[PDB]
Amino acid sequence: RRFEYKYSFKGPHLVQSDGTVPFWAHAGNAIPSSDQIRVAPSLKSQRGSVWTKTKAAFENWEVEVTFRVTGRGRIGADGLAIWYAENQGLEGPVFGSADLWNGVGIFFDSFNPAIVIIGNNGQIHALASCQRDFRNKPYPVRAKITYYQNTLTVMINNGFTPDKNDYEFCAKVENMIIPAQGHFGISAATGGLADDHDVLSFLTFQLT
Amino acid sequence: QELQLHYFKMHDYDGNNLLDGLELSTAILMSEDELINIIDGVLRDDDKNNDGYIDYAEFAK
Ligand SMILES: [Ca+2]
Ligand SMILES: [Ca+2]
Ligand SMILES: [Cl-]
């Protein structure tokens, strides 16, 4: 694995003095801060997103995304999406993003809770899933998403412990083709019910 | 040299005794393209095994 700084962010100096995240663009009501990005806050009817400024061209890759979804309800909304897509996702009704993309979304759907892998070829408006309660966990939840030899695997650290390497299997998609070049991204949304959707770090690795 | 070891440690925020490009970004408003040029140069010159991390010996050459 080679760590790829230009497709990554993390604390404790995550945001620059002008409020930007180096190498990433943010939109909607995403709020970057020194130790995390609040991609959508626990207010009604929010959308926000953060996307890499440039495309990555990695044949094989792995991302480790550390996040929290926190709210007062036993039920919350809407959730968070981790993306690899040919184009930067404009705003829309899909966890803060547009409903047509070319690539793959890993959706943490609160309103369940379920984690679902959705592929798209840039011409449509669920390939595998698992049930995990990723809300209101005592330690950060982590998703490790690996694309290697045409197989997409999602592993989840459910945040019940402070062991950052305690990943368990969620889902896998075999024989998957995705864009050769694309942006990495995160989006989140809320509705009438609303959680804080916080991403502490997004760490991208090229695999060889 | 002790100043230099201090520079390395003070920028190793995750405490893995390695610097990556994000940590290096803090160790220098400079544009992101100029930042990228500088970080890429450091990694090219220092990162022997091309894993995106440099240790202290590699940093100090
Ligand atoms: Ca470090
Ligand atoms: Ca190295
Ligand atoms: Cl890292």
Residue numbers in the entry:
A (entry chain A): 44 to 154, 162 to 175, 186 to 268
B (entry chain B): 70 to 97, 111 to 143
What does the paper say about this structure?
Incorporation of the cargo glycoproteins into the transport vesicles is mediated by transmembrane cargo receptors, including ERGIC-53 and VIP36. These cargo receptors are termed leguminous type (L-type) lectins because they share homologous carbohydrate recognition domains (CRDs) with structural resemblance to leguminous lectins such as concanavalin A. ERGIC-53 (ER–Golgi intermediate compartment protein of 53 kDa), the most popular marker for the ERGIC, functions as a cargo receptor between the ER and ERGIC for certain glycoproteins, including the lysosomal glycoproteins cathepsin Z and cathepsin C and blood coagulation factors V and VIII. ERGIC-53 consists of a CRD, a stalk domain, and a transmembrane region along with a short cytoplasmic segment. However, biological role of this stalk domain remains largely unknown, since binding of ERGIC-53 to its cargo glycoprotein cathepsin Z or immobilized mannose was not affected by its oligomerization states of ERGIC-53. It has been shown that ERGIC-53 forms a complex with MCFD2 (multi-coagulation factor deficiency 2), a 16 kDa co-receptor possessing two EF-hand Ca2+-binding motifs and thereby operates as a cargo receptor specific for factor V and factor VIII. The data provided a working model of cooperative interplay between ERGIC-53 and MCFD2 in interactions with FV and FVIII; MCFD2 binds the polypeptide segments of these coagulation factors, whereas ERGIC-53 captures their N-linked glycans.
Hence, we performed further crystallization screening using a different construct of MCFD2 (residues 67–146), and eventually obtained well-diffracting crystals with a different crystal form (space group C2). The Ca2+-binding loops (residues 155–161 and 176–185) of ERGIC-53-CRD and the loop comprised of residues 98–110 of MCFD2 along with their N- and C-terminal segments gave no interpretable electron density. Although ERGIC-53–CRD and MCFD2 both possess two Ca2+-binding sites, Ca2+ ions were missing in the ERGIC-53–CRD crystal structure. This occurred although 1 mM CaCl2 was contained in the crystallization buffer, while MCFD2 held the two Ca2+ ions. The absence of Ca2+ ions resulted in disorder of the sugar-binding loops of ERGIC-53–CRD in complex with MCFD2, as previously observed in the Ca2+-free form of ERGIC-53–CRD alone. In contrast, the present crystal structure along with the previously reported crystal structures indicated that MCFD2 assumed an almost identical conformation in complex with ERGIC-53-CRD irrespective of the presence or absence of the Ca2+ ions in the sugar-binding site of ERGIC-53. The Ca2+-dependent conformational disruption occurring specifically in the sugar-binding loops of the ERGIC-53–CRD/MCFD2 complex may explain how the complex releases its cargo on the secretory pathway.
